[PDB]
Write an enzyme that holds these catalytic residues in place. Structure first.
Site, PDB file in Angstrom:
ATOM      1  N   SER A 145       8.053  -2.419   9.175  1.00 29.21           N
ATOM      2  CA  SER A 145       9.022  -1.118   8.821  1.00 29.21           C
ATOM      3  C   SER A 145       9.949  -1.213   7.772  1.00 29.21           C
ATOM      4  O   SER A 145       9.750  -1.906   6.598  1.00 29.21           O
ATOM      5  CB  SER A 145       9.421  -0.569  10.267  1.00 29.21           C
ATOM      6  OG  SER A 145       9.918   0.655   9.863  1.00 29.21           O
ATOM      7  N   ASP A 199      -0.542   6.117   8.554  1.00 34.22           N
ATOM      8  CA  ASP A 199       1.344   5.584   8.533  1.00 34.22           C
ATOM      9  C   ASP A 199       1.742   6.508   7.340  1.00 34.22           C
ATOM     10  O   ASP A 199       1.424   5.906   6.473  1.00 34.22           O
ATOM     11  CB  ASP A 199       1.337   4.383   8.733  1.00 34.22           C
ATOM     12  CG  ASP A 199       2.715   3.804   9.077  1.00 34.22           C
ATOM     13  OD1 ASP A 199       3.545   4.617   9.008  1.00 34.22           O
ATOM     14  OD2 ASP A 199       3.000   2.787   8.866  1.00 34.22           O
ATOM     15  N   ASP A 239      -6.377  -2.148  -7.552  1.00 32.45           N
ATOM     16  CA  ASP A 239      -6.628  -1.662  -8.762  1.00 32.45           C
ATOM     17  C   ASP A 239      -6.605  -0.019  -8.927  1.00 32.45           C
ATOM     18  O   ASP A 239      -6.451   0.358  -9.960  1.00 32.45           O
ATOM     19  CB  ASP A 239      -8.432  -2.012  -9.152  1.00 32.45           C
ATOM     20  CG  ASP A 239      -8.296  -3.411  -9.474  1.00 32.45           C
ATOM     21  OD1 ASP A 239      -7.367  -4.122  -9.882  1.00 32.45           O
ATOM     22  OD2 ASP A 239      -9.763  -4.047  -9.223  1.00 32.45           O
ATOM     23  N   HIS A 259       2.588   4.321  12.866  1.00 34.08           N
ATOM     24  CA  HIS A 259       3.657   3.251  12.119  1.00 34.08           C
ATOM     25  C   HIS A 259       4.005   2.355  13.514  1.00 34.08           C
ATOM     26  O   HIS A 259       4.126   1.104  13.019  1.00 34.08           O
ATOM     27  CB  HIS A 259       4.989   4.078  11.834  1.00 34.08           C
ATOM     28  CG  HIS A 259       5.909   3.168  11.135  1.00 34.08           C
ATOM     29  ND1 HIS A 259       5.794   2.436  10.037  1.00 34.08           N
ATOM     30  CD2 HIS A 259       7.245   3.040  11.416  1.00 34.08           C
ATOM     31  CE1 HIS A 259       6.758   1.931   9.664  1.00 34.08           C
ATOM     32  NE2 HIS A 259       7.777   2.237  10.566  1.00 34.08           N
TER      33      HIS A 259
HETATM   34 CL   LIG Z   1      10.438   0.957  13.428  1.00 31.78          CL
HETATM   35 ZN   LIG Z   2     -10.933  -3.879  -7.551  1.00 39.09          ZN
END
Ligand SMILES: [Cl-]
Ligand SMILES: [Zn+2]
Ligand SMILES: [Cl-]
Ligand SMILES: [Cl-]
Ligand SMILES: [Cl-]
Ligand SMILES: [Cl-]
Ligand SMILES: [Zn+2]
EC number: 3.1.1.-
Length: 270
Positions: A145, A199, A239, A259
């Site tokens: 986090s 997340d 990329d 998360h």
């Molecule tokens: Cl956290």
């Molecule tokens: Zn690539």
């Protein structure tokens, strides 16, 4: 996909991040064993790793952590825990650029850089001693986090201050700087950055605000509370900026539970 070996490594280092949530660990007397009272760092405990140094949250800082030594894996471990007010950060944090003096054109998020700068001088002094006592050990810098953001910046800086082979395990990290900074960190190598499904934390600050992630991305695609297998991690080379977790859409508070679940419930110790 990844190999079984890699998966086992990724499932291991996150447990040092899990330990960093426990006040019992980050205020431990030096020499004490790391322990997770809710049972989310069993492999850390199995190593017998002990605290060499720690630093607590307080009235003056939201960042806590420790340096430990793992004699099973021949590793000095630097772990950071950031603010546990993370829902509020997603909802309402303001992001500001600063120049951290790391590389040409490089800018970092001011909050995260300020957190590292506050603790840097003592951590640098302490690592010199801990490494002197364990001179063939690797340095692993780890967090989850907001702690993973601080870990990323600490690692970057430490690699130029005597630790060029320092490894970074940054679980559920926000972006920490601009394109130049991301490129510089990526080229240092030894970076293991993780995201999970949709997340929202690794989606901030936004691409439209000039921030860029370190590559590669290890994107865990399995759901919350599911065991991660070797086929549940996609490795994205960066990329394309909107591959991986960013591709799941703009950050939503309704996705926040994603998360917490990075192999284990990482923040159970809070
Ligand atoms: Cl956290
Ligand atoms: Zn690539
Ligand atoms: Cl191990
Ligand atoms: Cl303090
Ligand atoms: Cl340059
Ligand atoms: Cl999910
Ligand atoms: Zn294992």
């Amino acid at each position: 996909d990844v190999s079984t070996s890699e998966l086992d490594q990724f499932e291991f280092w996150v447990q040092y991040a899990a330990a960093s949530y426990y006040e019992a660990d980050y205020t431990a007397q030096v020499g004490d064993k790391l322990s997770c009272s809710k049972g989310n760092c069993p492999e850390v405990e199995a190593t017998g790793a002990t605290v060499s140094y720690d630093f607590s949250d307080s009235t003056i800082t939201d960042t806590a952590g420790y340096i430990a030594v793992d004699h099973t894996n021949s590793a000095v471990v630097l772990a950071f825990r950031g603010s546990y007010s993370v829902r509020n950060w997603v909802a309402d944090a303001t992001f500001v650029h600063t120049n951290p003096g790391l590389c040409d054109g490089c800018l970092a998020e001011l909050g995260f850089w300020s957190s590292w700068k506050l603790v840097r001088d003592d951590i640098i002094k302490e690592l010199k001693e801990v490494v002197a006592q364990n001179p063939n050990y690797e340095l692993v810098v780890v967090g989850h986090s907001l702690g993973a953001a601080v870990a990323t910046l600490a690692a970057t800086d430490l690699r130029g201050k005597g630790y060029p082979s320092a490894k970074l395990y940054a679980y559920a990290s926000p972006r920490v700087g601009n394109a130049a900074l991301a490129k510089y960190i990526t080229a240092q190598g030894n970076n293991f950055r993780f995201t999970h499904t949709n997340d929202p934390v690794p989606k901030l600050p936004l691409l439209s605000m000039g921030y860029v992630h370190v590559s590669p991305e290890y994107w865990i695609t399995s759901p919350n509370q599911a065991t991660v297998s070797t086929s549940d991690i996609k490795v994205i080379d960066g990329d394309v900026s909107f591959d991986g977790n960013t591709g799941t859409g703009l950050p939503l508070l309704t996705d926040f539970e994603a998360h917490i679940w990075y192999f284990v419930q990482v923040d159970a110790g809070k």
